[PDB]
Amino acid sequence: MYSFPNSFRFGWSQAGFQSEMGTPGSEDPNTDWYKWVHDPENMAAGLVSGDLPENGPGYWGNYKTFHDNAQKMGLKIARLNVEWSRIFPNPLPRPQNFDESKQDVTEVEINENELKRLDEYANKDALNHYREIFKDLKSRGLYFILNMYHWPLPLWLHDPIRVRRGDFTGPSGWLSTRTVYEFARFSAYIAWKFDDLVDEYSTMNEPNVVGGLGYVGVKSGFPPGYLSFELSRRAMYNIIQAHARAYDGIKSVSKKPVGIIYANSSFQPLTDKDMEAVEMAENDNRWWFFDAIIRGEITRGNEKIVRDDLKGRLDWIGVNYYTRTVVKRTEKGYVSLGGYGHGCERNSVSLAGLPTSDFGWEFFPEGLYDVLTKYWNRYHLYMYVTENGIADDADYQRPYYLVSHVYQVHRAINSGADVRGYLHWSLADNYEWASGFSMRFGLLKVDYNTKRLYWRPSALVYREIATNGAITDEIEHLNSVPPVKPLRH
Ligand SMILES: OC[C@@H]1[C@@H](O)[C@H](O)[C@@H](O)c2[nH]c(CCc3ccccc3)c[n+]21
C-alpha cells in the first residue's frame, strides 16, 4: 500500500475549448482556435486534422453526467477553465490613454467601477451557465481549481490567419500589450463573479506551449503558426506580465490562492557526460520563467534586472507532466534527442525500449518525481499535479501509466515535497487541438455520435485509488512498465 495524506485529493483536469462543445447550443465560434481549425488553408496543409470542436464531447450540456461519474469514481478535485470568448465575445473599447507602444505593463488599475463597466459588456447567458456548471460541480463534493486561460483567445483579440499570413496590423494575440491589459481585467472580473464557488485560482495553462508552438514549433498547427524566434520571445514576455497583472487583479477581489499551470518534461542526460546539458535545458525551459514570476528576475534587452511588479506573483505551482526529454551536450550548447520522450513513433517503443502512446510519447514515470522535487527544492511552493495522462483509446497502457505516476507523487511527498493533489488528464475523451478527436486521453471513452461516456478499466482502477486515498495492495503490481512484447514495435 501507498497511502496519501488525508487532505490530498484525486481528480481531473479539463479544458473549455476541448470539452464544452458537441451538444447543440454550446457552439462558440469566437476564438482564434475555432477559426484556426476551420481554416481551409490550414486543413489543406494538414496543419489541423479537419476535425471540428463543435462535434466534441458536449460538457456544456452534459456536465451533470460528467460530474456523476467523477463522484462515482471517488474524485474530490477538479480543475477547468472559463472560456474568455464566451464571456466577452465582442470587442471592448480601447483603454483610455493606455500606451500600446510601451513594452512593460507594470500595473493595470482595477476597481469596483471598472468591474461594473465590464459587467455591461459580459455575455450573461454564458456567466449563468458557468455558474450552473460550477454549482453542480461543487454539489458533488469537488474542490474547485478555476483556471482563467487554456489557449483560445477572443477573436476580437487575435485573428490568427492574418498573423500566419505575415500581416501584423490586426488583433495580434500575445504579441500585443492590449491582450496583456484585457487579460488582467478578465481574470479580476471572473474572480469577482465566481469567488464564492472557487477554492484556488490558476491564471494560465502552459503559457510556454502557447508561445513555443505558436511561433517556433510550427508543424504542430498551433495559432498563429508564424515562425519567429523574436516574436516567440515577445509573446512570452507579454504572457509573463499578463500572469503578474492577472495575479494582482484577482488578489484585489480575493484572498484565495493564485497559481499557474505549466508544461514540464523531465530533462535527462543521454550519457553521464550530459548533466550540465540537463541544467541548461532546465534553465531554458523552466527556471527562467519561474524566476521571473517568483523572484522578479527577468532578462530584458541584454540585461538582468529585478522587476518589482513581477516579484512574488505566485502562491502555488501547477505541474503538468507526461514524459521526459533526453538531452546531450553540444559545443554551442545542448540538444534534445528524437526517439525519446515526446519525439517517438506512435504505438511502438522508444530508443530505450520503453513503450510509446497513441501519440508517440515514451513511458517514463520517474520524470514526475524529478520535476516535483526539483521545483520544491528551488521554490518551496506547494504543487498540484494539474495534468498527467496518456493517449490510449484501447486502454492497454493507461492502468500502468496511472498507478506508476501516482506512485511517483507518493514518492515525492515522501521526500518532503508539498504536493496536495493529482489530477488526471482527462476524465473523458476530448478534442486534442490540431490532432482532433483521435488522441483519446480519458478515463472515460466518449462515443461522439451519441455523446455517451464509458468506463475504461483504468477508470475502475482510479476509483480504487481515489475512494481509498491509496494505491491499494491489490493494484500495486500496476506500478510497472506495460509489457512491450505483446505491444506493437
Ligand atoms: O496532450 C494532452 C494534453 C492536452 O489535451 C491539454 O489541453 C494540454 O494542457 C496538454 N499539454 C500537454 C503537454 C505538452 C508539452 C509540450 C512540450 C513540452 C512539454 C509538454 C499535454 N496536454
Side-chain angles (χ1 to χ4, degrees), residues 1-119 121-330 333-484 486-489:
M1 204 183 207
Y2 296 103
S3 281
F4 282 84
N6 296 296
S7 59
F8 193 94
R9 294 167 205 262
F10 289 98
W12 90 101
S13 287
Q14 188 164 309
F17 181 73
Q18 287 180 279
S19 295
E20 289 166 343
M21 287 182 260
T23 45
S26 62
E27 200 192 75
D28 175 7
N30 303 133
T31 60
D32 52 0
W33 262 102
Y34 186 95
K35 176 168 193 200
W36 180 263
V37 303
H38 284 80
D39 178 75
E41 286 169 310
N42 286 342
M43 292 182 56
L47 285 175
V48 299
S49 71
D51 285 1
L52 305 175
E54 57 272 23
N55 298 137
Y59 181 67
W60 199 247
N62 305 321
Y63 59 97
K64 289 188 157 159
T65 313
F66 277 63
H67 301 151
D68 195 23
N69 285 297
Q71 187 180 41
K72 297 180 159 147
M73 231 157 85
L75 305 183
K76 267 139 71 181
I77 191 161
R79 160 256 155 162
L80 47 200
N81 73 299
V82 295
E83 281 289 285
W84 198 344
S85 61
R86 285 190 188 274
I87 314 298
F88 299 99
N90 303 115
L92 260 34
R94 264 173 200 82
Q96 210 45 112
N97 57 278
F98 152 90
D99 183 19
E100 222 168 296
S101 59
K102 202 200 165 195
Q103 181 210 195
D104 302 14
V105 177
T106 58
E107 80 140 298
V108 172
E109 174 188 302
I110 321 167
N111 53 65
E112 210 197 335
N113 276 33
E114 197 189 16
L115 291 169
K116 304 260 193 52
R117 295 296 76 72
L118 273 169
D119 210 59
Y121 281 95
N123 168 11
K124 276 303 182 302
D125 284 334
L127 281 160
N128 283 154
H129 200 95
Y130 279 124
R131 174 154 292 270
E132 281 164 350
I133 294 176
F134 304 157
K135 261 171 166 163
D136 188 84
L137 189 143
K138 289 314 288 295
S139 78
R140 317 280 192 160
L142 295 157
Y143 197 87
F144 182 33
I145 298 167
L146 183 55
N147 187 42
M148 302 307 175
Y149 180 61
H150 198 129
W151 302 2
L153 287 169
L155 261 177
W156 69 265
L157 280 160
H158 190 208
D159 178 344
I161 316 305
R162 208 152 156 203
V163 174
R164 198 251 273 145
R165 283 167 174 159
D167 178 9
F168 301 93
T169 61
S172 288
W174 294 112
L175 296 180
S176 157
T177 51
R178 172 92 205 269
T179 308
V180 176
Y181 170 84
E182 295 302 345
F183 180 68
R185 308 167 67 223
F186 170 71
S187 299
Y189 181 82
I190 288 303
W192 183 64
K193 309 299 281 208
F194 292 114
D195 199 61
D196 64 305
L197 294 179
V198 179
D199 284 297
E200 326 206 20
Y201 291 101
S202 183
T203 58
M204 311 184 280
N205 179 87
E206 311 186 341
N208 54 325
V209 171
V210 168
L213 302 187
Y215 310 92
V216 191
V218 292
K219 292 167 65 166
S220 299
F222 275 46
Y226 189 82
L227 176 56
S228 174
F229 289 160
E230 192 204 327
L231 292 190
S232 185
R233 299 181 190 113
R234 179 181 317 169
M236 283 320 290
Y237 185 73
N238 281 337
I239 226 162
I240 284 166
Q241 15 179 241
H243 163 76
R245 244 73 282 152
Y247 181 100
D248 289 345
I250 290 158
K251 283 294 189 212
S252 74
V253 196
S254 202
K255 288 165 156 52
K256 280 162 185 178
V258 184
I260 204 191
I261 301 158
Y262 198 87
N264 299 290
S265 88
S266 183
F267 298 94
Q268 298 289 320
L270 179 64
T271 74
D272 57 24
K273 299 211 202 163
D274 290 312
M275 304 238 74
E276 164 143 308
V278 161
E279 295 175 338
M280 301 171 63
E282 295 172 321
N283 287 328
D284 294 356
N285 292 280
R286 205 138 83 216
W287 304 148
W288 84 279
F289 180 92
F290 277 94
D291 289 0
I293 53 154
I294 286 161
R295 296 168 179 183
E297 302 168 5
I298 192 148
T299 293
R300 189 202 53 220
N302 301 169
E303 215 80 359
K304 295 145 77 164
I305 50 156
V306 171
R307 270 183 59 185
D308 296 318
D309 66 290
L310 290 192
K311 193 169 176 207
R313 269 65 178 192
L314 199 71
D315 311 322
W316 65 275
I317 300 169
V319 170
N320 281 16
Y321 176 88
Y322 292 79
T323 193
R324 62 165 173 182
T325 296
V326 172
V327 300
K328 67 157 172 182
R329 247 301 202 162
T330 285
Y334 84 84
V335 286
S336 300
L337 288 133
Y340 303 98
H342 72 249
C344 305
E345 274 158 59
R346 310 193 172 196
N347 299 112
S348 187
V349 111
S350 79
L351 295 174
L354 296 159
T356 68
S357 68
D358 297 355
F359 225 159
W361 304 347
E362 183 185 38
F363 194 95
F364 199 74
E366 310 56 63
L368 184 49
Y369 175 82
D370 173 65
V371 171
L372 285 173
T373 53
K374 284 195 174 142
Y375 269 122
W376 175 255
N377 302 332
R378 180 162 186 113
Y379 304 121
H380 297 87
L381 290 170
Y382 74 97
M383 294 160 291
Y384 283 102
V385 173
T386 35
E387 269 180 54
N388 181 253
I390 186 173
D392 187 4
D393 183 26
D395 210 45
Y396 296 147
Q397 296 188 56
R398 189 177 286 107
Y400 300 90
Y401 189 95
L402 176 72
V403 179
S404 305
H405 285 80
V406 165
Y407 167 76
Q408 303 294 326
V409 183
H410 192 274
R411 259 244 280 175
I413 297 175
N414 185 241
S415 282
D418 190 359
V419 186
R420 303 199 182 161
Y422 165 95
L423 300 69
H424 197 72
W425 190 275
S426 194
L427 181 70
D429 299 335
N430 59 250
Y431 184 70
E432 184 62 27
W433 303 112
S435 300
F437 295 113
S438 64
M439 298 297 104
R440 288 177 176 266
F441 274 90
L443 291 148
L444 308 171
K445 185 168 170 75
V446 174
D447 173 352
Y448 283 109
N449 300 118
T450 72
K451 316 299 168 194
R452 185 176 169 170
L453 312 171
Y454 297 82
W455 282 56
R456 294 186 172 110
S458 58
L460 297 172
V461 173
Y462 200 26
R463 184 226 240 157
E464 289 305 299
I465 304 190
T467 71
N468 293 285
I471 301 159
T472 51
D473 289 338
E474 27 277 286
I475 63 173
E476 188 166 337
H477 67 291
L478 291 168
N479 175 219
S480 54
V481 185
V484 294
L487 296 178
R488 182 184 171 175
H489 333 118

